[model samples]
Target chain A: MECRLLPYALHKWSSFSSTYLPENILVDKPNDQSSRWSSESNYPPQYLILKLERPAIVQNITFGKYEKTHVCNLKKFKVFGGMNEENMTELLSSGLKNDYNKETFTLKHKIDEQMFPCRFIKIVPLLSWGPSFNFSIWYVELSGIDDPDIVQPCLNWYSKYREQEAIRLCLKHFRQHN
Target chain B: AMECRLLPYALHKWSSFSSTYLPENILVDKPNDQSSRWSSESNYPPQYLILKLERPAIVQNITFGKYEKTHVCNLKKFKVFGGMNEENMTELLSSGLKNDYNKETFTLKHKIDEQMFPCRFIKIVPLLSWGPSFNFSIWYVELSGIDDPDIVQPCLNWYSKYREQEAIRLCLKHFRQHN
Candidate 1:
């Protein structure tokens, strides 16, 4: 009757700053000073892409900054949705960045805008702190619907359908390899 | 209908299958034979294929090939949907095709005006079809189009196509954990 579709993958196409890896964004772990997705310094702007294993109707997004420090925190950024890098719709483009070192920087968008069925979500941080500014994000939460099920739970694990596909993939490889 | 020209090859990041023969085999095209194919599990009520192209393309046409061997696997009734992705997909056209040993491809009701139709992803559902007693299979699929004419469809086949072939197999996941 009800389900969740969060916990999207960081994906293979994703690329972050040299210091900022993609794992920190998808993995819901405690964000210590060391565990963060920061940007590289002095770059005009930098971006990261997260491709959902399957497409979803993304309604809301939440980006948490470092609770300890506001250094390299997001100032201005943009978000887009589509199937791949080549094609995407710019869903959100924040005017000026806000400091979220103290709280969860959330942006509730696109739910009433339209059903943004997308496999790829791209985030670009336009401005950073000073020289050491890496514009890191502690965590990014996406709210969306996975097709038929409108109100599903967080998409962390394989559901009944994905579970079946994953296993079928296993058998497929099993049949081919052996 | 005019002859359809195959567009540049597109990559499939995800595919939904039920006891499929092989997921990747469906897209590995070489032009000759059903040399490779993909099939669904037996007796599944509904069947669908959602394929995403490189960019938003004004679809020209779609060709559904017949199983190389027999007409049994050919689709008798099907519908096509288009949208940016699966969640927002809307039905574009629905019709039937010949169940012959040869390939079957049908043009949409709106191929003439590219401006009227533009979509980055296409979802094909074989609502009702003649199958091999129980299962449904596809020899190959070739949907053609030019990237969205309204917007600048730039080059992207650069060193940017994400590679997941190795990773997809390595992490097939704990499917048994479900049921």
Candidate 2:
């Protein structure tokens, strides 16, 4: 059987700069208004930080946006990965074509370096296809195999925290609305 | 255990769309475009959709894609029922979708006690809208499960703290919001 790669579910708490809901940027759908994230008329050097539910051996990154005829198509960007936010290492640097197509960048590590286990994936946009000021990415997907040893614990922690937050919010709302 | 697979919508027949948006339009892989979603015109609560699968499969997660707009027909609270037939379905899941977070992956796994189950029909009921209007819209619906019933399904820990009834009740009530 041919092994099929799956996109990791992104943590909701991703951080970024001047984005119109960067969370939806990785919705794994075609390029559209709701799925894309547009930087608020900002210049380059902008960064988007995404966290996966667990660490994985990332193979590639997929990017998509509107066609070149329209502004906001991404041009070039640098990818970074690490175990945590503060310790990111540059993994790959790539660019997208101006056409209305999705670009997949196959990530590679140095010959002397081992494959990096990444939990936090960061994208730093360097240029835009348009006027080079504002930029938008419709979709961003990561395909990887989870580091098996560290998988369940991370998921359990995330599930626990999310449930706790949900319970807290429910309690708060019930107290007020009841 | 093997990773759950995304079940394709093509093999099933969609029934009860509540609007002119045919199954072909709503159950698509397209981006969240305004022209591609199902919008309820009934202008009331409890709009629903039903899917009849080709065969019973173990479903682990159900995901719904809603419009990014805050109050403009975005799904608020919803429930799901599963069974072999529409009349005999039982409530399998209950949850809420945020109005404006635009951040909600809106992917819900079966509650711990429920784990996963083999079902052929899945029914989704939208109970409320964020705007207090009768309308609600959904971009797409996805089911992640073992498409083949013969596969060994992953089991959840029965004693997991996340399955405690008190917390589950509170969260469910909170998700119910107005009802």
Candidate 3:
């Protein structure tokens, strides 16, 4: 049998920093208005689309930090699979129920720190819990043994942003926020 | 790093038997060849070679039989950097003594039949006053935590061939003089 390596990338959301606004005023502010504040402006939730050339057997994933912090929240990470762009867009736009094939695994650090085996993976940043946040995307590696029962064809898509480039931009935005 | 201690012991030879012949189709002619009369062959001498890479880690050499009476010789089992093939060979040859690194040790066990001995065929061969007449067989495996995958592959290949040679030597040393 033969092995093939594919080009893959990760895209990260923009980060922002601001003065500690109390809970009441922050909740009252409109979503658009929240972006005006230094703190909220950098913390906009990001959406990513992964386009894959063909379906692949994903054996493991790893995450690296752009800025190390004890405050990052990774509990809400989610992944979805779709047959086409419209389906992916609908799945991302309307929550995973409408057009996505969802899997029940969630990111938990308590498991072994290094590996996770999955068929397809998409990560979602639910919210930032810290006053200032900085995170970057490291590469994802996929491996599989030759088995006809486990192989499929699909493409990876990310939400309109260049995967690795967007991660660099996120680092830049993080520096500005600080 | 702590100074490593070498475990000094006499080298013990081991053997196993198989009736199956290479290419699988050639049948032994019992009447024409006295050695071929028995379904299998035995007591092939196995050779042991050892080299040291870094000290303090205990290396265990083990053998398992895949087929009956297949003897291997000049088997060397050691831990060397995976990428340094030439360096590993040079060290193995230049070291010039059995277990010079004190890293070579043997452990033997039968998976299917637990009552077998190191050099004698336990069953399937008609016993004579001398011993069971049969061939010897062996297998190789490695266990280590070294991180470089590129180097680990080649290191495994080197150890495997070394063990095969040792198995063959064991067969000749034990059986050739008697029969």
Candidate 4:
């Protein structure tokens, strides 16, 4: 049994100058919307997806941050079990259809650094509040017990196949049982 | 099972003596053996033998404490595979005659404190202090990994059967299969 760590990225919006905007709204405002609700530099929403090498009994997930900022607001959070990018998209879309929104799992805190555990994590941000803002991730650590049952059978089969190949190779030099 | 019976022996001598008249002069003249011997005031001696439980693994046997002041007081400390006293002695004795006198035979400390030794005679002796005048009571402590649930069982089992050399041999054979 083995475990692998996958890489992910954090995206952030730097500035916002709108007063009439609702605090919880996550999407980009309409182009024709009122000027009071619009910003000069409206940033796009971002996502961080983690790919797993093997299916695991994911025990815990923790993340830490480097800097403190109140401008960043986590709007969504989720976990997706998918084999590939397309499958991941489909799983996420299906979750959205069921109104399993990301806000329920989102965390709102003001800190220089923190670590938390979640099964599968997704984070979405609301409008940026300060100029020259940044969201820096120090690191993320995942802990879990390997699923031995999944790998053991495959290893056994491989070993048997290798043994057969070795016997075939040695048939030219010596022979005994049929 | 063998069964045996014990018989009581009868004494033949019987005497009648007066406590007041015969013993006063004899008691005054008796040698004072009890008075000559001085009892040490401190019931709790300064020297002690400590057996510290260590992490379950292979470890080296070494002496701990002030060896300079106490010349006769020396500790022979080593790790035993089993957590129990009996198994520990058997393993210690049976691991061959090399370094037989002072050194401990088994050096495997239990990783988990909660688990029993595989062989009942396994124990980790971190500190065993012998003193000049008196011998301290053997101390056994459950260390760090006592709270860890994962390795506790195996550690306990390792110490439980520490004395069973044949069982340990079988275990080594089985352990090779995993490798």
* Positional deviation of residue B163's Cα in model 4 after best superposition, in angstroms: 73
For each candidate, report its DockQ versus the true two-chain complex.
0.10, 0.15, 0.00, 0.01
**B23-124: candidate 1 lDDT, tens digit per residue:** 445565533555365566543665666677766665667876655455565567778887545564657778877777665666654332333345667777
Off by over 4 Å in 4: A1-42, A67-70, A73-76, A89-138, A150-178, B1-179
**What is the per-residue lDDT of model 2 for residues B94-174, given as tens digits with 9 covering 90 to 100?**
887876635344344444364554566788787777757546666677877776544522222222233345557856675
Give me the overall lDDT of model 2: 0.62
> Candidate 3 lDDT, tens digit per residue, B102-169?
22333322111332111111111112212233232112222222224343354444544453454345
Candidate 2 residue B137 Cα shift, in angstroms, is: 1.3
Off by over 4 Å in 3: A1-45, A66-75, A88-121, A129-135, A143-149, A152-178, B1-179
Residue-wise lDDT of candidate 4 within A10-106, one digit each (tens)?
2222233445332212222223122112223435433444434443334344443222323332222333332223222112221111121221212
Best by lDDT: 2
Assess candidate 1 and give its lDDT: 0.57
* Candidate 4 chain A weakest ten by summed lDDT: A94-103
Q: Estimate the Cα RMSD of every predicted model relative to the unseen true structure.
A: 18.7, 22.5, 23.7, 23.5
* Model 2 / residue A123 / CA error / Å: 81
lDDT of each: 0.57, 0.62, 0.28, 0.30
Please tell me which model should have the higher TM-score, number 1 or number 4. 1
Candidate 3 has a TM-score of: 0.22
Q: After superposition, how far is residue B26 of candidate 3 from its true place, in Å?
A: 99
lDDT of 4 by residue, B1-179 (tens): 11111111111111111232121111121222222111222224232122223233222222212211222223333322333332223232122112122322232343334443322222322223233343221111211223233444555455444434444455455434533
